[PDB]
Design an enzyme around this catalytic site. Structure first.
Site, mmCIF file in Angstrom:
data_model
loop_
_atom_site.group_PDB
_atom_site.id
_atom_site.type_symbol
_atom_site.label_atom_id
_atom_site.label_comp_id
_atom_site.label_asym_id
_atom_site.label_seq_id
_atom_site.Cartn_x
_atom_site.Cartn_y
_atom_site.Cartn_z
ATOM 1 N N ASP A 181 0.826 -1.201 0.000
ATOM 2 C CA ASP A 181 0.000 0.000 0.000
ATOM 3 C C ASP A 181 0.865 1.257 0.000
ATOM 4 O O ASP A 181 1.901 1.301 0.665
ATOM 5 C CB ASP A 181 -0.858 -0.041 1.258
ATOM 6 C CG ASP A 181 -1.786 1.139 1.387
ATOM 7 O OD1 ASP A 181 -2.678 1.276 0.532
ATOM 8 O OD2 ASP A 181 -1.634 1.980 2.317
ATOM 9 N N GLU A 231 1.502 -0.170 -4.844
ATOM 10 C CA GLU A 231 0.444 0.822 -5.089
ATOM 11 C C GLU A 231 1.103 2.194 -5.100
ATOM 12 O O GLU A 231 1.315 2.795 -4.033
ATOM 13 C CB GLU A 231 -0.668 0.791 -4.023
ATOM 14 C CG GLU A 231 -1.816 1.668 -4.495
ATOM 15 C CD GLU A 231 -2.367 2.620 -3.473
ATOM 16 O OE1 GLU A 231 -3.273 3.386 -3.866
ATOM 17 O OE2 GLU A 231 -1.943 2.656 -2.327
ATOM 18 N N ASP A 274 -3.203 3.876 -11.802
ATOM 19 C CA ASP A 274 -4.641 4.321 -11.833
ATOM 20 C C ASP A 274 -4.978 5.150 -13.082
ATOM 21 O O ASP A 274 -6.142 5.423 -13.300
ATOM 22 C CB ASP A 274 -5.030 5.224 -10.629
ATOM 23 C CG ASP A 274 -5.021 4.527 -9.273
ATOM 24 O OD1 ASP A 274 -5.235 3.317 -9.220
ATOM 25 O OD2 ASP A 274 -4.862 5.221 -8.227
ATOM 26 N N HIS A 277 -8.808 5.926 -14.178
ATOM 27 C CA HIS A 277 -9.392 7.260 -14.155
ATOM 28 C C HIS A 277 -9.862 7.685 -15.530
ATOM 29 O O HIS A 277 -10.940 8.277 -15.687
ATOM 30 C CB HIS A 277 -8.368 8.269 -13.661
ATOM 31 C CG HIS A 277 -7.882 8.001 -12.273
ATOM 32 N ND1 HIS A 277 -8.548 7.167 -11.391
ATOM 33 C CD2 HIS A 277 -6.843 8.534 -11.587
ATOM 34 C CE1 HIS A 277 -7.919 7.182 -10.225
ATOM 35 N NE2 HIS A 277 -6.888 8.009 -10.312
ATOM 36 N N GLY A 322 -14.895 2.820 -2.695
ATOM 37 C CA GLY A 322 -15.126 3.303 -1.296
ATOM 38 C C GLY A 322 -14.785 4.750 -0.990
ATOM 39 O O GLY A 322 -15.259 5.308 0.019
#
Ligand SMILES: OC[C@H]1O[C@H](O[C@H]2O[C@H](CO)[C@@H](O)[C@H](O)[C@H]2O)[C@H](O)[C@@H](O)[C@@H]1O
Ligand SMILES: OC[C@H]1O[C@H](O[C@H]2O[C@H](CO)[C@@H](O)[C@H](O)[C@H]2O)[C@H](O)[C@@H](O)[C@@H]1O
Ligand SMILES: OC[C@H]1O[C@@H](O)[C@H](O)[C@@H](O)[C@@H]1O
Ligand SMILES: [Mg+2]
EC number: 3.2.1.141
Length: 580
Positions: free
Chosen positions: A262, A295, A315, A319, A390
């Site tokens: 993470d 990540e 990402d 996106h 989330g």
């Protein structure tokens, strides 16, 4: 000739001794004047060895309960292997040698063969345990995913949570099951030929239950901060070894096939050998095939080519895809135009930002680096994951955002699952699940009230601390049996079978992948010695015939898969087709 810094002889925490002699207890403290271990309610003074190291051996075995006593203060073990009464309680002594593994014929999984399926143990099943999750393994195998990506399991406070407030990194969170229940889950996955990856959080400790400063303030530094407290000081070797020893536990002792690190941008380290490089050295020393993923939002190839990690959650693809389908522009979505031409570019480049200015207000800088060194498997792509669902006020999924059709949702799946990049799906994605994935937590006292207040202020927003918010995020398995849920699931099964079987889609080289657009139609072409495939996705509002799409090559003629099951090569709004 890298030598691990870890020796089981000197392992911190409680380690069973050979020959049934009991347990060796060890800790490091830079400040305590009196040091004892309290085992099954009885205190025993520990031996000072120098360097703040303390040790004692006693004839207690696996199952014994203990904590440490520092200047008279009972203090949980940060190296606890299990915490049956939660993060403020006694640890249990665990023996990793007792579990009867049956996965000798499993040898890990290569990144290029991964299709990840992200599981949150607490919500994945009604019971919210490893044992209940294991019962869904045959479903996941038949679905066609190949690697489960489990959200963090380090013990945190309260009775549910995402996992990012983990505080005792070596202790699997007790509500999900005991250590042997976790081992049983991994063993069962391996027997079905599925890999299992674990999300680990080496950039911060959660706000409740991290007692490391009680032993030595110098695990942490005031030079920089985390979300929850003082930053993790990777200049301090004991801090380095806390996380490398943890990574080695998960891989060796629980048979995980890889780790997803993470928030790697926030693992700050100015050492000669960066902690990410040392993590890769330490896990490789195990002599297996384990993988490490980062990540990381910096679009920095050095994570692979210098730190020797295997790949990066990237990402930009997510996106660009979401903006294409919703037009939204809040927050980091302002970094993307979306659309066929934009998606063709992002895919071509792997990520979009390769050093150009990122104009997002509050974040302005020259973002990223050239992606040339990275190969298709090094990029992990998705259209949904825990954060991209989330971190929305209502936790809604992509097909549940305003203005997104199920046809567009199904097209997006075809684009994701035919690209040579490494794909990840979020639990329930495959059947267009009806339930959100909201942020939930269960902290005590003032900290809990602060979480609820923080969420309200940030963005009716579901209270993270309410039981209902956790329950509203539970998967409803029965719904997948009917209607559009079943239709979506059939398409996911068909796409995952094509990915597995189709000899051209086996491509894993960016050299063989080209992209382009005609108006609102995106095309993605793969050419290898096995043949040619073209994915066409109509991102327009109208109907487009494949014959009328302007392409710089001759379109292949055979219809391999249409996202709405049509017979003819025509694309309704939002629909996609693979041809060969
Ligand atoms: O500052 C981080 C690194 O930046 C450069 O490396 C990136 O950009 C290069 C081209 O500018 C690529 O070849 C390389 O793959 C990228 O990671 C620089 O070359 C590195 O030495 C820096 O560590
Ligand atoms: O309708 C006004 C907006 O038009 C563009 O945004 C649309 O078209 C993009 C592709 O060019 C799509 O990705 C996006 O979802 C659509 O909203 C324009 O980019 C926007 O700035 C305009 O507000
Ligand atoms: O994906 C790009 C985004 O990554 C995020 O997780 C970073 O926290 C944010 O600042 C950035 O805008
Ligand atoms: Mg045109």
């Amino acid at each position: 000739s890298f030598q691990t810094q870890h020796d089981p002889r000197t392992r911190l925490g409680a380690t069973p001794l050979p020959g049934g002699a009991g347990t060796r207890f060890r800790l490091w403290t830079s400040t305590a004047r009196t040091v004892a271990v309290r085992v099954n309610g009885t205190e025993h003074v520990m031996t000072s060895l120098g360097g703040g190291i303390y040790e004692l051996e006693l004839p207690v075995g696996p199952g014994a309960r203990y904590l440490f006593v520092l200047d008279g203060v009972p203090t949980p073990d940060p190296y606890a292997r299990f915490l049956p009464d939660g993060v403020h309680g006694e640890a249990e002594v665990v023996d990793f040698g007792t579990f009867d593994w049956t996965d000798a014929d499993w040898h890990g999984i290569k990144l290029a063969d991964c299709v990840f399926y992200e599981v949150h143990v607490g919500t994945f099943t009604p019971e919210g345990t490893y044992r209940a999750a294991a019962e869904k393994l045959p479903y996941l195998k038949e679905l066609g995913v190949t690697a489960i990506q489990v959200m963090p399991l380090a013990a945190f406070d309260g009775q549910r949570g995402w996992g990012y407030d983990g505080a005792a990194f070596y202790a699997p969170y007790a509500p999900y099951g005991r250590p042997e229940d976790l081992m049983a889950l991994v063993d069962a996955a391996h027997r079905l030929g599925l890999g299992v990856f674990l999300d680990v959080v080496y950039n911060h400790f959660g706000p409740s239950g991290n007692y490391l400063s009680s032993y030595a303030p110098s695990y942490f530094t005031d030079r920089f901060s985390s979300a929850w407290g003082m930053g993790l000081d990777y200049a301090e070797p004991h801090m380095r070894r806390y996380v490398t020893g943890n990574a080695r536990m998960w891989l060796r002792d629980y048979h995980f096939d890889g780790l997803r690190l993470d928030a790697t941008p926030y693992m700050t380290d100015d050492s000669e050998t960066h902690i990410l490089t040392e993590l890769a050295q330490e896990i490789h020393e195990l002599g297996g095939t384990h993988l490490l993923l980062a990540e990381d939002h910096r679009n920095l190839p050095d994570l692979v080519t210098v730190n020797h990690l295997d790949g990066i959650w990237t990402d930009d693809f997510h996106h660009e895809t979401r903006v294409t389908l919703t037009g939204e522009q809040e927050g980091y979505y302002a970094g993307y135009r979306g659309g066929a031409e934009a998606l063709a570019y992002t895919i071509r480049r792997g990520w979009r930002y390769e050093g150009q200015f990122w104009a997002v207000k509050g974040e302005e800088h020259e973002r990223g680096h050239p992606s040339d060194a990275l190969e298709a498997p090094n990029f992990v792509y998705c259209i949904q994951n825990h954060d991209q669902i989330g971190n929305r006020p209502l936790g809604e999924r992509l097909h549940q955002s305003d203005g997104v059709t199920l046809h567009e949702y199904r097209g997006a799946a075809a684009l994701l699952l035919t690209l040579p990049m490494t794909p990840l799906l979020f639990q329930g994605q495959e059947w267009a699940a009806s339930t959100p994935f909201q942020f939930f937590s269960d902290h005590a006292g003032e900290l809990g009230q602060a979480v609820s207040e923080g969420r309200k202020k940030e963005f009716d927003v579901p209270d993270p601390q309410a039981e209902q918010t956790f329950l509203n995020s539970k998967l409803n398995w029965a719904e997948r049996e009917g209607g559009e849920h079943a239709r979506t699931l059939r398409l996911y099964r068909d796409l995952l079978r094509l990915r597995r079987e189709d000899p051209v889609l086996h491509n894993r080289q960016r050299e063989n992948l080209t992209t382009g657009h005609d108006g609102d139609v995106l095309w993605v072409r793969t050419v290898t010695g096995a043949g040619e495939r073209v994915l066409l996705w109509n991102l327009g509002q109208d109907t487009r015939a494949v014959a009328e799409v302007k392409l710089p090559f001759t379109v292949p003629r055979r219809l391999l898969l249409h996202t709405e099951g049509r017979e003819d090569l025509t694309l309704g709004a939002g629909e996609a087709v693979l041809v060969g």
